[PDB]
Scaffold this active site. Structure first.
Site, mmCIF file in Angstrom:
data_model
loop_
_atom_site.group_PDB
_atom_site.id
_atom_site.type_symbol
_atom_site.label_atom_id
_atom_site.label_comp_id
_atom_site.label_asym_id
_atom_site.label_seq_id
_atom_site.Cartn_x
_atom_site.Cartn_y
_atom_site.Cartn_z
ATOM 1 N N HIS A 54 0.324 -1.135 0.208
ATOM 2 C CA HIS A 54 0.084 0.030 -0.354
ATOM 3 C C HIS A 54 0.563 1.526 -0.180
ATOM 4 C CE1 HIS A 54 0.687 -0.690 4.604
ATOM 5 N NE2 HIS A 54 0.045 0.449 4.366
ATOM 6 N N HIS A 56 1.276 3.368 2.075
ATOM 7 C CA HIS A 56 1.766 5.068 2.797
ATOM 8 C C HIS A 56 3.399 4.727 3.510
ATOM 9 C CE1 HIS A 56 -2.211 3.959 5.503
ATOM 10 N NE2 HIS A 56 -2.152 5.246 5.164
ATOM 11 N N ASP A 58 5.520 4.696 5.332
ATOM 12 C CA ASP A 58 6.868 3.455 6.241
ATOM 13 C C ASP A 58 6.159 2.266 5.281
ATOM 14 O OD1 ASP A 58 3.253 3.612 7.135
ATOM 15 O OD2 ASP A 58 3.650 1.942 8.078
ATOM 16 N N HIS A 59 5.623 2.283 4.250
ATOM 17 C CA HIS A 59 5.519 0.937 3.496
ATOM 18 C C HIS A 59 6.867 0.932 1.869
ATOM 19 C CE1 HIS A 59 3.061 -1.184 5.950
ATOM 20 N NE2 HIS A 59 3.034 -0.206 6.151
ATOM 21 N N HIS A 112 -7.688 -0.580 4.846
ATOM 22 C CA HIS A 112 -7.115 -0.159 5.624
ATOM 23 C C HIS A 112 -6.398 1.038 5.026
ATOM 24 C CE1 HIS A 112 -3.522 1.528 7.577
ATOM 25 N NE2 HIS A 112 -2.641 1.451 6.862
ATOM 26 N N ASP A 131 -0.928 -3.873 5.323
ATOM 27 C CA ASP A 131 -1.337 -3.652 6.538
ATOM 28 C C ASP A 131 -3.133 -3.839 6.836
ATOM 29 O OD1 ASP A 131 1.181 -2.439 7.976
ATOM 30 O OD2 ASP A 131 0.330 -0.669 8.046
ATOM 31 N N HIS A 169 2.986 -5.128 10.602
ATOM 32 C CA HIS A 169 3.890 -4.376 12.035
ATOM 33 C C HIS A 169 3.885 -5.096 12.495
ATOM 34 C CE1 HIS A 169 3.834 -0.245 10.228
ATOM 35 N NE2 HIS A 169 2.873 -0.478 9.692
HETATM 36 FE FE LIG Z 1 2.338 0.694 7.875
HETATM 37 ZN ZN LIG Z 2 -0.190 1.563 6.818
#
Ligand SMILES: [Fe+3]
Ligand SMILES: [Zn+2]
Length: 254
Positions: A54, A56, A58-59, A112, A131, A169
């Protein structure tokens, strides 16, 4: 296919996939380049791909840097065609994609985010859920709906029980606290939670988990359980989806 975790940031898991047959290697959800750079520097190999679950940060963090600094190709959803940094291949639901001759199923898994996909390698009995599904919880519903998340969770739970799940995560310990506050009578959950505390007490991962386990312990997959519904004033008239959205709301404010 070897599957190496890469604990980026504070609790992010990226995954380096090694193609033993040859030298094919990719990375799932590189939060940032540095952690991926370190491992590859060791493996002695270069990066061929970058698959994102996805958009975001953080990915997709280390995306542009790894691509330019390796010649890797970015593989990811078609819905987020303009949100996945440097995306070269925009895959659709049910698309098959070959990682060196290793089949990958591309399942859309909205909830998400809209556009989130999960990647199932049947040959390795492994699915990268980003996520959408963690161990003992699901992702926060930033864009999708309670109904969309339930549908996505059911696609993942329609796979064999032995299918290992590589939660996006390290949230398992916290997830277990909320899970035990709702279904303290399910001993499989009490049992698994204790093992989770042990691993985390010595800084070890609780991922991969498995479809078998999450069916036996994740409250978002057990929302019809009577004890879980009463613990959250979930009326009996509520259906699957409705029960999931009530749990997601409480966990958020737990
Ligand atoms: Fe994440
Ligand atoms: Zn995410």
């Amino acid at each position: 296919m070897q599957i190496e975790l890469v604990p980026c940031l504070k609790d992010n898991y990226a995954y380096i996939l090694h193609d033993e047959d040859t030298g094919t290697v990719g990375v799932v959800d590189p939060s940032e380049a540095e952690p991926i750079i370190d491992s590859l520097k060791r493996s002695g190999r270069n990066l061929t791909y970058i698959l994102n679950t996805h958009h975001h940060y953080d990915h997709t963090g280390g995306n542009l840097e790894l691509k330019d600094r390796y010649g890797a190709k970015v593989i990811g959803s078609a819905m987020d065609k303009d949100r996945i940094p440097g995306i070269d291949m925009a895959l659709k639901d049910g698309d098959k994609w070959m990682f060196a001759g290793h089949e990958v199923h591309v399942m859309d898994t909205p909830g998400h985010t809209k556009g989130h996909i999960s990647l199932y390698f049947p040959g390795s009995r492994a699915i990268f859920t980003g996520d959408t599904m963690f161990s003992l919880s699901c992702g926060k519903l930033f864009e999708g709906t309670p109904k969309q998340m339930l549908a996505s969770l059911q696609k993942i739970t329609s796979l064999p029980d032995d299918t290992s799940i590589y939660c996006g995560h390290e949230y398992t310990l916290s997830n277990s606290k909320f899970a035990l506050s709702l279904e303290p009578n399910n001993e499989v959950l009490q049992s698994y939670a204790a093992h989770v505390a042990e691993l985390r007490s010595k800084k070890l991962p609780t991922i991969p988990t498995t479809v078998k386990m999450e069916k036996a312990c994740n409250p978002f997959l057990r929302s019809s359980n009577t004890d879980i519904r009463r613990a959250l004033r979930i009326p009996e008239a509520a259906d699957e989806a409705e029960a999931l959205g009530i749990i997601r709301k409480a966990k958020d404010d737990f």
